[PDB]
Amino acid sequence: FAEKVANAESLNAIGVLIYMDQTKFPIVNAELSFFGHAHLGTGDPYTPGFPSTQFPPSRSSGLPNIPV
Amino acid sequence: RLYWDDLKRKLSEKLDSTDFTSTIKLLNENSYVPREAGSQKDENLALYVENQFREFKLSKVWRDQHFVKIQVKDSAQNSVIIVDKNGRLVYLVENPGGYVAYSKAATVTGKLVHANFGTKKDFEDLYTPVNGSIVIVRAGKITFAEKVANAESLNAIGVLIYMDQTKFPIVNAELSFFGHAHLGTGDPYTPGFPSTQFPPSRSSGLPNIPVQTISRAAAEKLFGNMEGDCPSDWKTDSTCRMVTSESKNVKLTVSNVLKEIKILNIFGVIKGFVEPDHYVVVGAQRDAWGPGAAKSGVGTALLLKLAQMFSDMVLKDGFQPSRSIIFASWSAGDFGSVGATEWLEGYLSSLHLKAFTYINLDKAVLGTSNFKVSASPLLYTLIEKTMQNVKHPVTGQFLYQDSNWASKVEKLTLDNAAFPFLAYSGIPAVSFCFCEDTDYPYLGTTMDTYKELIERIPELNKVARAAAEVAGQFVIKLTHDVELNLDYERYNSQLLSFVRDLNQYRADIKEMGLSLQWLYSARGDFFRATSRLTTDFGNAEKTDFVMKKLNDRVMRVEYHFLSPYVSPKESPFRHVFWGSGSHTLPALLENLKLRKQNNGAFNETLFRNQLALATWTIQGAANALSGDVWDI
Amino acid sequence: LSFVRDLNQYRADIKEMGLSLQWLYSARGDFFRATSRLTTDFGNAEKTDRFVMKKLNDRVMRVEYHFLSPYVSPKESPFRHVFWGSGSHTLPALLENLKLRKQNNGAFNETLFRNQLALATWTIQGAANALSGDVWDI
Amino acid sequence: TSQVRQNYHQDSEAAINRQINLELYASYVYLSMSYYFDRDDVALKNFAKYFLHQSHEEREHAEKLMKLQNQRGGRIFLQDIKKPDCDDWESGLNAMECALHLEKNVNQSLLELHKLATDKNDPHLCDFIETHYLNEQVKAIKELGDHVTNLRKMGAPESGLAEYLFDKHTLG
């Protein structure tokens, strides 16, 4: 899902919506919600991981700038 | 296997049975005096190096061939000129015989202001503004490149460097010297892809301001037009003045152009008996702008004599090296060890697993009395067991006279050959030097000759014997002993010195409101890793899987004190204890010294980035010493 | 060999540049001689010893580690493995930038592609000098 | 600015003023060498006769350079003149060696100035140095080499009889 978010950001979109299709996912439940991630890569994205206060951005990871 | 002090006797009896000064006189012969890079006689001298390595029946010698861009003067030569405004015209004071290498081929004109050496603190003691003006300084205690970087710091456009009579006791008031000012180590002209396009470099240390050497008599002729008394703090002659007059100024013209040369690093390898791939690096600068008795008459000579004695102990008596031995004779070393860096650009992080010690044969013979050591800390205690049983040449006592030798270690500068191994590629390196309070007077001049070198020190054979003895005991201790004589417990004092810098400044940390618990957790991880490695050494074998693995884990400890948090093309200096850059620890010390005042030079977000990356580097290296995941 | 086959199909793009690819094929020859010589060393390997067999086993363990690119940052691009990872320094990104040459669109950067080719050639040279081990084995 | 100046680079005027300083320095050195021998405790009057000359010739060298520099229309920025290197020359032979060394320095400076004038495309300055200063310095260096060789073969500075006969016959 993070490739979907980052590639939609690469064409400067402002939103990502991800559902479950019936053909690829033969699910009886149509109101089902699922869970995922939005990190392009691994490791903790929210890392001001020095022992501590102040609020720094990440700035060395490549976070998504649009909601999903 | 033989016995240890018997092999010490073998070393001691092959050191006393080898002439040393004959090679130094042989390189000073009339057919070999100009050996500057790119010339015919430098190629002939590389052929002579290849001949001398072929004379002793070694395993394999070859050439390391590279096609590099250096910068050599044109037909137009350098000029230093006194210009006056009121009569619009000029006066040549010096067309110097020597030149600062890799300077910008341009022409600058500005008011001349005199500084002591060219440091930051000596610029902050000045009276006169620096911006848009040429600053004349003296060589001493720093490199040329740090002078150029300090002139880049305060918008200065030119640097003139003169040898004084007080620091340098030279009767020749007109002798010109040689210099290089790469901000970093290597080729500054590195858009390093082969091809006819012209791209900029922009990340390889280009001096965008001119810089040029001058002599002493022309310096006195410059001070003849300068005003303002020099301080008694700077310890100069009576000649010295500070700033030129109202309408007079100084014009500098440097005329160095490109040159495509070939460098040939002569490599000679000797195999061992058991361990084929790991080795101690034994390298030596070889070329010289001038004659090079001490600059080249020492490193190449000691390299060839160590090749002689080690080929004797291989072929004649049956010494058993545990691992292989190398001998490297370098080209383009006068420019800032360009060839060594271009050899280590292909060998950035694929050599520290095998090659584990650089020994500095360069600038080991400079004087008689003082034995000063600047080295990687893993080698230190090895050096300690070296200093206790090697004779002093003239006095006759021991070399281990001071038990406070490891704490007052003067740091390696840019212009040495062991510092790129220490800070760029992560190989431990040692530099030992015989010298005195006065520096070597002929570093880069035309009078670095065999005559003055043999005249000042009549026991040059004995001084070279003591230097080759500590080098040979380095080689034999590292390549025959069943363990490695490397001290990881000096790093306890290093990290505890960083925490000691932090404990005295904790009030400025508590102004920020930090709980520093993960940093002390990393220091506890480091301390438990050292204690558990000592306990594992309490149950480790000697002549047996586990032993080479423990030895390589001890080898890797200097490599983990590099920073893996930056890119090498932007910052080649990544070592936090010895290197340079904002991510390093002395930059954090100076940025925290900027915190005690409300100066705008203090960048607080950059300081937080420094502190976070430093704590993460301490955490990563302290976990890297632990090895297996059970050892926490 | 598949990377060399990807290269031989597009050597027309390299010969319009007018450059020779000698060091990459030298690293490939060093790699294949390293495989043949370590197979010959496996022909000289016993079963239940301690001194040479575990060393050969560690040399075969380290083959995964010495494909990581030393020329990019772990903080900038954490995926440094050139075969399975991602980033501009990898070999599929080199093939993508070589795909971008066939048109006159601005996605193709010449000097960045030459940087990728140079650093990938030096990475394969380092891997060839890493698996082959000793300087006697080149 | 000037009005007669044409094809005259500023580095040329710089090297001219350097050369004028060197020539006046040489004249002052020969003055010291001349009146060193006029003392009682050396007493070689024909050495003083010779070394009082070859200072006037270098004075004419400096004045001819200054006349040349005012022809091409620059200025004359002139520095101090420095005292000589040594005073007690300890003999008459060693003074000839120091004069030889000084004339070779003057020749080296003239060759550097000729290379500078060739680099700047100034044919008049090249022609001036070819016509006036190169040939005279070659003849002077050859003459001082002759005198050094005569005083070395006659056994000086052991017996000053060699100095006396050389002063009376060759430089008389």
Side-chain angles (χ1 to χ4, degrees):
Chain A
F1 304 103
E3 286 184 353
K4 293 184 175 71
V5 176
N7 290 319
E9 186 179 0
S10 179
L11 290 177
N12 293 318
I14 63 170
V16 176
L17 293 177
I18 301 165
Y19 67 99
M20 295 181 286
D21 53 353
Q22 186 179 1
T23 300
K24 181 63 179 176
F25 287 166
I27 300 173
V28 179
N29 194 1
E31 291 179 351
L32 184 64
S33 66
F34 61 95
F35 191 78
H37 65 282
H39 185 199
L40 185 63
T42 61
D44 195 0
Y46 292 163
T47 308
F50 61 95
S52 65
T53 60
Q54 293 293 322
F55 292 156
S58 296
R59 295 293 297 163
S60 178
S61 66
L63 293 176
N65 290 317
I66 56 170
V68 55
Chain B
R1 185 176 177 87
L2 296 177
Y3 290 158
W4 180 252
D5 289 331
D6 294 330
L7 299 174
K8 183 180 75 174
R9 291 186 297 114
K10 290 291 182 184
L11 180 64
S12 178
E13 74 186 5
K14 289 186 183 293
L15 284 160
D16 290 330
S17 65
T18 301
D19 192 2
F20 287 166
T21 59
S22 297
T23 304
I24 299 171
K25 188 177 180 180
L26 198 151
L27 299 182
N28 209 167
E29 291 174 353
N30 292 318
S31 177
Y32 284 157
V33 173
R35 67 276 299 277
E36 189 178 0
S39 67
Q40 186 66 257
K41 294 180 180 180
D42 197 2
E43 185 176 0
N44 292 316
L45 188 59
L47 288 172
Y48 179 72
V49 169
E50 185 177 2
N51 207 165
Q52 290 294 320
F53 280 105
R54 286 176 187 269
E55 283 182 353
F56 290 104
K57 295 179 182 179
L58 299 179
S59 295
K60 184 179 178 181
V61 298
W62 67 85
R63 294 181 182 178
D64 182 65
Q65 181 180 3
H66 300 288
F67 290 159
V68 294
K69 299 181 179 68
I70 66 168
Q71 195 176 1
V72 178
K73 69 180 180 66
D74 202 357
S75 64
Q77 297 174 179
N78 300 320
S79 68
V80 183
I81 294 169
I82 298 169
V83 178
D84 198 357
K85 179 180 181 293
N86 58 5
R88 288 187 298 273
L89 275 311
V90 294
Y91 172 79
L92 182 65
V93 65
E94 190 176 3
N95 42 2
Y99 64 95
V100 175
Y102 292 155
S103 180
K104 183 175 74 175
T107 297
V108 291
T109 302
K111 186 187 286 186
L112 187 66
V113 177
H114 187 270
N116 193 3
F117 291 155
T119 62
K120 292 181 180 180
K121 187 256 183 65
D122 293 331
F123 284 173
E124 292 178 353
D125 292 330
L126 295 175
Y127 177 73
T128 307
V130 184
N131 48 0
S133 296
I134 298 169
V135 175
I136 184 167
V137 296
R138 292 179 288 172
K141 301 285 102 175
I142 57 172
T143 67
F144 303 99
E146 295 180 356
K147 301 176 182 67
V148 174
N150 289 284
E152 186 179 0
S153 178
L154 292 174
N155 285 320
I157 60 171
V159 175
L160 298 179
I161 299 162
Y162 68 99
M163 295 187 289
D164 52 353
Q165 187 179 1
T166 298
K167 175 68 176 177
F168 289 156
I170 300 168
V171 183
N172 193 0
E174 294 179 353
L175 179 57
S176 66
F177 56 91
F178 186 77
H180 63 275
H182 173 204
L183 185 61
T185 59
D187 192 2
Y189 292 156
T190 271
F193 60 95
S195 67
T196 61
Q197 295 294 322
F198 290 159
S201 296
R202 300 290 293 164
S203 179
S204 65
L206 296 173
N208 291 318
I209 51 173
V211 53
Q212 178 62 40
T213 174
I214 60 170
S215 65
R216 186 176 68 187
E220 296 177 353
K221 291 182 180 180
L222 285 172
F223 288 120
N225 284 318
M226 297 173 73
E227 291 180 352
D229 290 331
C230 288
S232 65
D233 298 332
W234 293 358
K235 267 63 186 297
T236 181
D237 295 332
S238 65
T239 310
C240 192
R241 300 292 188 272
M242 291 295 291
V243 175
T244 57
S245 297
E246 183 70 28
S247 64
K248 292 188 284 187
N249 52 2
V250 171
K251 185 174 180 179
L252 178 57
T253 300
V254 180
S255 64
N256 295 319
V257 299
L258 289 173
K259 187 176 180 180
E260 180 70 29
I261 69 160
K262 178 178 72 175
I263 54 170
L264 298 174
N265 293 320
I266 302 299
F267 288 165
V269 297
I270 302 168
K271 293 180 182 179
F273 284 98
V274 176
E275 191 175 4
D277 55 352
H278 299 170
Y279 62 96
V280 178
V281 183
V282 178
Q285 251 177 281
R286 185 261 311 278
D287 55 352
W289 175 67
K295 195 170 279 296
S296 302
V298 168
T300 303
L302 291 174
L303 188 66
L304 293 178
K305 302 294 105 174
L306 286 174
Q308 177 175 1
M309 293 182 287
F310 288 155
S311 179
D312 287 332
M313 281 188 283
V314 167
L315 294 173
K316 293 181 181 179
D317 291 333
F319 176 76
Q320 293 181 356
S322 295
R323 63 177 63 89
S324 296
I325 302 170
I326 202 167
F327 297 100
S329 181
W330 298 102
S331 179
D334 293 328
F335 294 158
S337 295
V338 174
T341 303
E342 301 295 331
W343 184 69
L344 288 174
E345 286 185 352
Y347 288 160
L348 178 59
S349 66
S350 65
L351 190 65
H352 64 89
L353 297 177
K354 295 188 264 76
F356 76 103
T357 298
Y358 180 75
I359 299 171
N360 208 166
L361 292 174
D362 298 331
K363 294 186 286 185
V365 178
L366 298 174
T368 302
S369 297
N370 287 317
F371 172 67
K372 297 285 101 176
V373 177
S374 296
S376 179
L378 287 172
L379 294 171
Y380 280 177
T381 302
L382 174 62
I383 303 165
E384 185 174 0
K385 293 183 184 293
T386 305
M387 290 185 288
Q388 295 177 357
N389 54 4
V390 175
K391 294 189 287 185
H392 192 274
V394 176
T395 302
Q397 299 297 321
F398 287 159
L399 293 177
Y400 187 73
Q401 294 295 109
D402 194 2
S403 66
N404 199 72
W405 59 272
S407 69
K408 290 182 180 179
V409 174
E410 295 179 354
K411 64 184 179 181
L412 290 174
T413 59
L414 186 145
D415 55 355
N416 200 358
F419 187 74
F421 291 97
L422 182 60
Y424 179 72
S425 295
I427 298 171
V430 57
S431 179
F432 56 93
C433 63
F434 283 142
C435 63
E436 293 86 3
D437 293 332
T438 300
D439 289 332
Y440 187 76
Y442 290 151
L443 291 172
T445 64
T446 63
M447 287 183 180
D448 193 2
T449 62
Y450 180 74
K451 294 179 182 179
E452 185 69 25
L453 185 63
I454 203 67
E455 183 180 1
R456 291 178 66 249
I457 302 167
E459 290 84 4
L460 187 68
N461 197 0
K462 189 179 287 187
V463 173
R465 187 261 187 191
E469 185 173 0
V470 299
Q473 191 174 2
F474 282 162
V475 174
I476 295 171
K477 284 283 289 296
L478 291 173
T479 60
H480 186 74
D481 283 328
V482 294
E483 290 181 352
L484 292 175
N485 299 110
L486 296 172
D487 197 359
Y488 55 90
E489 294 178 354
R490 299 288 184 181
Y491 286 153
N492 285 315
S493 295
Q494 298 293 321
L495 291 173
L496 188 61
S497 178
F498 181 71
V499 175
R500 187 182 295 273
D501 290 331
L502 189 62
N503 288 124
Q504 298 177 356
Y505 293 158
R506 283 179 70 187
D508 288 330
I509 304 299
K510 295 295 287 185
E511 288 182 353
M512 294 175 70
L514 291 173
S515 178
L516 298 174
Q517 188 60 255
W518 291 354
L519 183 63
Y520 291 98
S521 178
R523 186 178 61 83
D525 289 328
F526 185 78
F527 185 75
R528 289 188 299 272
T530 57
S531 296
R532 191 175 296 113
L533 185 61
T534 303
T535 304
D536 290 331
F537 289 165
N539 290 319
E541 290 86 5
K542 300 294 189 291
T543 61
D544 290 330
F545 183 74
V546 62
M547 189 65 205
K548 299 293 183 182
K549 184 177 179 180
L550 289 173
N551 287 317
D552 294 334
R553 286 182 63 190
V554 173
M555 289 177 184
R556 288 180 181 90
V557 187
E558 180 68 28
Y559 177 74
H560 293 291
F561 284 165
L562 292 171
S563 179
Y565 294 155
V566 295
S567 179
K569 297 296 289 183
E570 293 179 353
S571 65
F573 289 163
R574 294 184 292 113
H575 197 272
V576 295
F577 288 161
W578 298 96
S580 296
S582 68
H583 59 278
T584 61
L585 300 180
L588 192 147
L589 293 173
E590 293 177 353
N591 199 359
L592 184 59
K593 189 178 286 186
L594 289 173
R595 194 186 186 276
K596 71 189 290 183
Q597 62 181 356
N598 289 318
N599 192 2
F602 176 72
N603 194 0
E604 188 173 1
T605 64
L606 186 61
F607 179 74
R608 291 176 65 196
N609 207 166
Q610 290 175 358
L611 187 62
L613 290 176
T615 303
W616 294 353
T617 305
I618 291 169
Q619 186 74 44
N623 289 319
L625 186 62
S626 67
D628 197 1
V629 302
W630 179 62
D631 296 333
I632 293 170
Chain C
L1 184 62
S2 179
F3 177 72
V4 167
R5 185 177 294 275
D6 291 331
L7 181 63
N8 290 121
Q9 294 179 357
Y10 288 156
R11 283 180 68 187
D13 291 330
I14 307 299
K15 290 300 292 181
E16 285 184 351
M17 293 167 65
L19 291 176
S20 178
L21 296 170
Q22 182 61 256
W23 291 355
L24 181 60
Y25 289 101
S26 178
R28 179 184 60 85
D30 290 330
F31 187 78
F32 184 75
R33 288 189 296 271
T35 57
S36 296
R37 188 176 294 114
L38 190 61
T39 304
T40 304
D41 289 330
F42 286 163
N44 289 318
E46 289 85 4
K47 301 296 187 292
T48 59
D49 293 332
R50 69 177 65 248
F51 65 98
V52 65
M53 187 62 212
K54 301 295 182 183
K55 184 177 180 179
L56 292 175
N57 290 318
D58 287 332
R59 290 181 68 188
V60 178
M61 285 180 183
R62 292 181 182 93
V63 186
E64 185 69 30
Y65 178 69
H66 292 287
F67 285 164
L68 300 172
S69 179
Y71 292 150
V72 291
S73 178
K75 297 294 288 184
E76 291 178 351
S77 66
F79 292 158
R80 291 179 291 113
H81 195 273
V82 297
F83 288 166
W84 300 101
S86 296
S88 65
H89 61 280
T90 61
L91 300 177
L94 190 147
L95 292 175
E96 289 174 354
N97 201 1
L98 182 56
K99 185 188 286 185
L100 290 173
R101 189 180 183 272
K102 69 187 288 184
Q103 61 184 355
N104 288 319
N105 195 0
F108 179 73
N109 193 358
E110 182 180 2
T111 61
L112 189 64
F113 180 73
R114 297 178 73 182
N115 206 168
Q116 289 179 356
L117 182 62
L119 299 181
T121 304
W122 291 359
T123 301
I124 293 172
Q125 182 66 39
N129 287 320
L131 177 58
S132 64
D134 194 2
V135 298
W136 178 58
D137 297 333
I138 293 173
Chain D
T1 186
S2 176
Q3 64 181 356
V4 306
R5 187 172 182 178
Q6 185 178 7
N7 195 1
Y8 192 76
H9 199 276
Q10 294 178 355
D11 300 335
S12 298
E13 180 168 356
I16 288 299
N17 296 320
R18 185 262 185 95
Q19 188 65 40
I20 293 164
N21 193 206
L22 184 61
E23 288 292 327
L24 293 170
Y25 175 74
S27 177
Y28 194 74
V29 168
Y30 282 113
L31 182 61
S32 177
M33 285 183 181
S34 176
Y35 277 154
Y36 173 76
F37 292 110
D38 196 76
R39 284 169 58 190
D40 57 351
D41 53 355
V42 175
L44 301 176
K45 287 183 181 178
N46 289 318
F47 270 177
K49 183 179 179 180
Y50 175 72
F51 278 111
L52 188 59
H53 204 192
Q54 291 286 320
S55 176
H56 294 171
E57 290 185 355
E58 306 297 326
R59 182 74 182 273
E60 290 178 353
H61 291 171
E63 292 177 355
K64 189 184 287 185
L65 282 165
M66 296 177 77
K67 189 174 181 180
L68 192 278
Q69 178 58 42
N70 281 320
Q71 286 182 357
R72 298 297 299 271
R75 303 294 188 94
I76 301 168
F77 214 64
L78 44 87
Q79 294 292 319
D80 291 21
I81 303 171
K82 289 241 203 221
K83 69 176 185 178
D85 289 330
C86 296
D87 285 331
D88 195 0
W89 307 106
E90 193 183 3
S91 68
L93 173 61
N94 201 0
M96 284 295 173
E97 287 187 353
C98 294
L100 182 67
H101 185 72
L102 188 62
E103 294 292 330
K104 282 174 71 176
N105 278 320
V106 175
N107 194 9
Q108 181 61 255
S109 177
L110 289 177
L111 295 181
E112 289 181 338
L113 207 153
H114 178 269
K115 187 175 181 180
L116 182 61
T118 302
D119 291 331
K120 296 293 184 183
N121 292 317
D122 191 1
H124 182 270
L125 193 61
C126 293
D127 178 74
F128 185 76
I129 298 168
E130 286 182 357
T131 302
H132 286 275
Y133 288 159
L134 294 171
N135 197 0
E136 295 176 354
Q137 288 299 113
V138 172
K139 292 189 287 184
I141 290 171
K142 176 63 172 65
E143 186 177 4
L144 293 178
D146 290 332
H147 299 302
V148 167
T149 306
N150 281 318
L151 285 173
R152 284 184 178 179
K153 295 295 182 183
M154 289 172 67
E158 292 179 352
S159 177
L161 179 59
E163 294 179 354
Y164 182 78
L165 294 174
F166 176 75
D167 205 13
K168 292 293 185 290
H169 291 288
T170 300
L171 291 178

